[PDB]
Design an enzyme around this catalytic site. Structure first.
Site, PDB file in Angstrom:
ATOM      1  CB  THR I  45      -1.013   0.044   1.175  1.00  0.00           C
ATOM      2  OG1 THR I  45      -0.333  -0.208   2.411  1.00  0.00           O
ATOM      3  CG2 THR I  45      -2.113  -0.986   0.979  1.00  0.00           C
ATOM      4  CB  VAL I  47       1.018   6.122   4.946  1.00  0.00           C
ATOM      5  CG1 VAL I  47       1.813   6.655   6.128  1.00  0.00           C
ATOM      6  CG2 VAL I  47       0.348   7.257   4.189  1.00  0.00           C
ATOM      7  CB  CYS I  48       2.211   0.547   4.982  1.00  0.00           C
ATOM      8  SG  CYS I  48       0.441   0.451   5.355  1.00  0.00           S
ATOM      9  N   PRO I  49       4.878   1.901   3.919  1.00  0.00           N
ATOM     10  CG  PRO I  49       5.159   1.627   1.615  1.00  0.00           C
ATOM     11  CD  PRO I  49       4.116   1.889   2.655  1.00  0.00           C
ATOM     12  CB  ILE I  52       7.866  -0.091   7.393  1.00  0.00           C
ATOM     13  CG1 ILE I  52       6.496  -0.579   7.878  1.00  0.00           C
ATOM     14  CG2 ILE I  52       8.899  -1.215   7.520  1.00  0.00           C
ATOM     15  CD1 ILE I  52       5.761  -1.483   6.898  1.00  0.00           C
TER      16      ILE I  52
END
Lengths: 193, 193, 193, 193, 163, 167, 167, 163, 193, 193
Positions: I45, I47-49, I52
């Site tokens: 997906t 904003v996840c990256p 992380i």
């Protein structure tokens, strides 16, 4: 009890279409229009799964001929599907397959079709739903065992033969092997033969 | 939930053996000794059923090679089975078949395997049980659709291949088509290819 | 118990005297015919034939006192047809003329409380009024056979009670002396004896 | 579920013996010793009842010869039973009968054998009990139909013969016509004839 | 308890004084007659006849205070009839002229709480007034009971009503 | 179902004795020793009840002779009982009676013997309990009569006659 | 939870009035008309209780003035109440008191107001109900004292002072 | 009701006369002291201070009859401390020398049945004797209460005990 | 709520820093390490990256204050591995060094109450003691991202409270002035301000 | 199931306004009008609490600028709230703060937002509510950890920015660094960088 010979449980799922766009597919949109081959596989980025998905996509035209809609289904998200399609085959990907992939992100579709294994992933299952929304065929393999495309096609052929003629299909029936009328006379001529 | 990939439900049934004598067969006697192919059919003296029973009996030696016990099962009594065996093929009979036929006279076996249709007769089902008493394969057809013996045999071959090697069997796998190790590298070599 | 009460409703697929398939329900005789519903465990067994053949031999005796003869077992109607096409010399019942009901779901045996071991019906007679009231019940466990002369006597006793309002004594038959259900009455009947 | 072919419901009851003395009979005292013909009748000072009771007492020797204890049972008290014995046949009495009459004053025996009609009186029922305590035969008549002593004796003969020879008795079997082996060859042998 | 409250409804088969069969219920008396419902265990006992004979002997005293005498036991109507037809010498009650109810289902004994060991009723008196209210209850375990007392009781009850 | 012919329900009550002292009386103290005539009446200080209780106290000697403990019982407290004994007969009291009067202050005794009316007071009742604590006789009057002192005396003699002989 | 500050539980009781006649008194007859001081005491014909009831009757005029109906209540019957009023003060009676004495013969009133002790008698209690039928004050004594006639009079004046002003 | 029965157990955080925090429970008094447990609705009200100040003024009368004075409300211990530290002029209770319990969970109010609208306790007195039996209960709806009466009550109670 | 209480137990298949598969449970850090369990909806997906990658950039900051960084999403560990092998320029997270947990059954999201619509976990932080007590919870609905500086501040505040017994005020950070949990105390801290 | 991303639990509470007057605030009055920053703190006359309340009141203008109603909430009564305002900072008071302080005297508000600790006091929780009444953000701290005003303001900025642009904000997003399109090209564009 079982849904085989009975109404297929309703589903509505987010999907990635052949062109890689996002959408939604539900069982109702097909009722009265075409047959549905719902196939479950455990996981994206695994082992038997891509070989099955690619094998079924290669035979896509054989499914179009038989007026059947081919739908793959796993617990993975639609974003995981798209990424697997953008992964080349030599790197364990499925490539740009032409048929629709469903996302059973809630696991409810696998739960409804009684193919959820360990509250985790769906088993390798074939569900053939006719134009009246009735399950005619069910095949469930364990995670290690890949399935045959020649076989569901033969199954599709046998079901469509029975629908058209009312004839019953014997053991090992192909097109155009000899069929049988469901009567005493009937059997009785076919076995004899 | 489902018993596929899980322990096969126990059964004990009166049976008619290959020599036409009466007896009793239970799942336990096979555990640790041989594979079980339990197949259900609706009714004696019907239509698709005899063609399937005869087709499977002709391939009996292919099953002996694979160390699998072939067991037919219907709701009919053992006396109805024996009479069907004493009925010539030209008169709608099954003749003197070599494998064991189970009597699910209480309907409990069909109920346990979730193949009982309308509290009446069992659906056309294949259940493949391994030597540890675990269901590896399930196939359910509606009453009008006969099944394929080449297909369960391929299924048996695929399961026994995985047991021996640990390799995973891809879509459409025969002996001796190329198998696959269940790893990333792995897949990844097979698809590429 | 339902003796002296309304017979439980049933509706069953049947094999008629002309070997054709149909459907019989209990409501269709209400106000038209008396019903002798008889149960037997299984087709292709032992005392069952002698009972069924003896009952069919004296069918004219049942027609004369306006009673429908209905046999019922757990077997499917295809098994019934097969047994009818088997000659007497081979354990078949031959071409009998009264209807045989298929209690394939076992519902009828359950409702009439004649189901043994959730498997087969016991050997039972149930005599049903033109008003749909059970007047007589007989249940044999052991394969001992039922005398036709006795249910014919029982039918005569029930029809005598209905016609003259007279109560039928011990060992009564057509057309020896009966007794009025009155104090006057009993005394007259018992001396002299 | 019916008790025919299973163990008879236990009963213990006050009773009037053949010598007109009061006592207590229970089912267990006959186990491994006597067959039991338990018979029910609605009321003492009525109509069909005495005719039956007298007809059964006339044949007492025949029961004693078959090692069967004859037991009458009704909802009436022992004092009613005694008074009815002290009443002459010419007044509607049974007179000085020699077999035992049980008193089902709580109605629990009728309830247990499922022969209680409208919480008031027992129907006319024969129950034949094994030396092992297993009910082999049940006959329930509506209040107006008298039963046959020749018929129960035939039934008793058919059961005791079956016990000794495992020989399965056909329709209308009498001591001692042609009987049947519970076999295939068997039924083929008997039906020809 | 129902003492001081309305009497539990009953409906039973009965043998009348003239030996005919019929039905008696509670409804047929309310607003018309007092009811003395008495219970006894069994027909053809040693003890029970003398009470019933004694009660029938004083029948005219009961008609005088407008009270219907009703005997009740668990025996059938036929047992009742036969007991009347039995001579006094053999233990019979003879040709009594008041009604005997058949409590063949034991319902009436259950409702009046006089059923003993689910078999027979105890020796009981129930006086139900013209409004259907139970004014008096007497229950004996094999105790003989007395006719002159119930007559006192009725007189005392019908006195208090007057007055 | 009824307790007549079965075991009399247990009770334990505060009591006013013959000498106007207080104490407790329970069922079990009499088993194997005395018969018990338990009698219920509605209220202390009513118009009808004195004449009954006075009549029963007048026949006290006949009860001792028949080995029967005579026990009155009402919903009233022991203080109501004592006061009623101290009220003179002309004012409407019971005077110095000699048998015990139990106090069913919780109403539990009236409930257990099924003589409670409208959750308020007990009806006029006789309960005769034998030396084994089995009820042999029960009499319930709604109103208000009542009751033959001779009849319970009669019914005491057979019962007692049957306890030894027949019929 | 408690009824203080909430609606007083409804009651309807047989009663002995000031003129020694009988009748009924219920809660609803006083709503919008009078305040109600409901007081509980254990038993008629006890040693302690007369002095309380006599003291309250001596201040009757002060209650009429404050528009409060004064109501005694015990488990005893109305016949016990009347008899106690007719017992002379020297013998241990209450004499001809003028306020009503309720009879909680069913014990339901004592239960509803939570003053019932061991299912037998009510504890010594004061319940003051205003003209809207809302309990403004509750006092419960186990034994046996008791109780300042001036204090309920004080607590009646504010309450009543607050019903018009502040604090 | 618990009047005449044993007092519902309580255990609470408390602010002592010396302003330190600690715990007070019911167990620590049985067989040792009488307990006057009083409830008031809220800290920093107009009405509540004068009662608490008046009760603390007569503290020596309470020590005389061996009775422990305990105030209780649904407020926290910190609210109690701050109220003591608030000057009388601003509506404070000042440096009172008897303990104030914190019924922060409302458990104690629930158990003594003085919780009103699941929010605050009513104005109540509970006198618990040396055996742990509740001898006196008083509950006011915003009614002021009196110190000289409770002292009469205690004297009367401890009199009846003696005697 | 579990804040201020013991963290619910979890045990999950994990992809480690070295791309190998393993298993992590919460009990294994009790008494050894602080735990920062963070949830994110899906792999592949948006904003996840960034979350992380930002968390992995400051991993040295977590190691220094003895805290295990554990990411957790609903995706399978194969999806996690695939995302790690996807470069940043293609939406992948690349070769991160902290562990990623697979909440494939959704059990962990349920127990921590962060599951939205029975599908995916919300963006959440959960800080767990060395004693296994949750000291901090943060839940974002919208893809707004979480600041690392803040949980680092929160970790410092929790570790400061544990070391000096001092209570941490509004806007506290390492190592400005804190306050003693005392009346003396607060007053000292608030004036002057 | 959590309420984050769903509608905020309804509350109605007595309150002390900025002018030190008593009133009543409820959640519905802000719907379609204001954002709501509901914040909980354990007790009035304690330690971390005032520092937080004063720090939040100092920044009142910044909230008024973001159209967010600032609401403090504790288990304390309104009279306790008022007394605490009338207490100088030098004595542990909050002084004359201008935003509203709600009184959760029944504890039901804390129960409804799942922040009640040990049935006594509320934890330190921030809840940010939409103009639609949807909770977008939840932050729960243990009793000893003070929170950051800069952090909630960033959170508010990140939410309002996301509302306006559908633009998905990454880790450590501040007004106004580089933000992200919720796309595939998307995340690929942002991560390079």
């Amino acid at each position: 009890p079982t849904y085989v010979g009975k109404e297929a449980p309703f589903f509505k799922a987010e999907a990635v279409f052949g062109d890689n766009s996002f959408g939604e597919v539900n069982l109702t949109q097909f009722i009265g229009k075409k047959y549905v081959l719902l196939y479950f596989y455990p996981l994206d980025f695994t082992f038997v799964c891509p070989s099955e998905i690619i094998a079924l996509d290669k035979a896509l035209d054989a499914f179009h001929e038989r007026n059947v809609e081919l739908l793959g289904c796993s617990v993975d998200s639609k974003y995981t599907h798209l990424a697997w399609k953008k992964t080349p085959l030599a790197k364990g990907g499925i490539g740009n397959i032409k048929h629709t992939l469903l996302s059973d992100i809630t696991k409810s579709i696998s739960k409804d079709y009684n193919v959820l294994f360990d509250d985790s992933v769906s088993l390798r299952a074939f569900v053939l739903i006719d134009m009246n929304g009735i399950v005619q065929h069910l095949l469930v393999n364990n995670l290690a065992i890949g399935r045959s495309v020649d076989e569901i096609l033969r199954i599709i052929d046998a079901i469509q033969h029975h629908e058209k003629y009312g004839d019953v299909c014997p053991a090992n029936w192909q097109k155009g092997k000899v069929s049988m009328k469901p009567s005493e006379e009937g059997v009785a001529q076919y076995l004899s033969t």
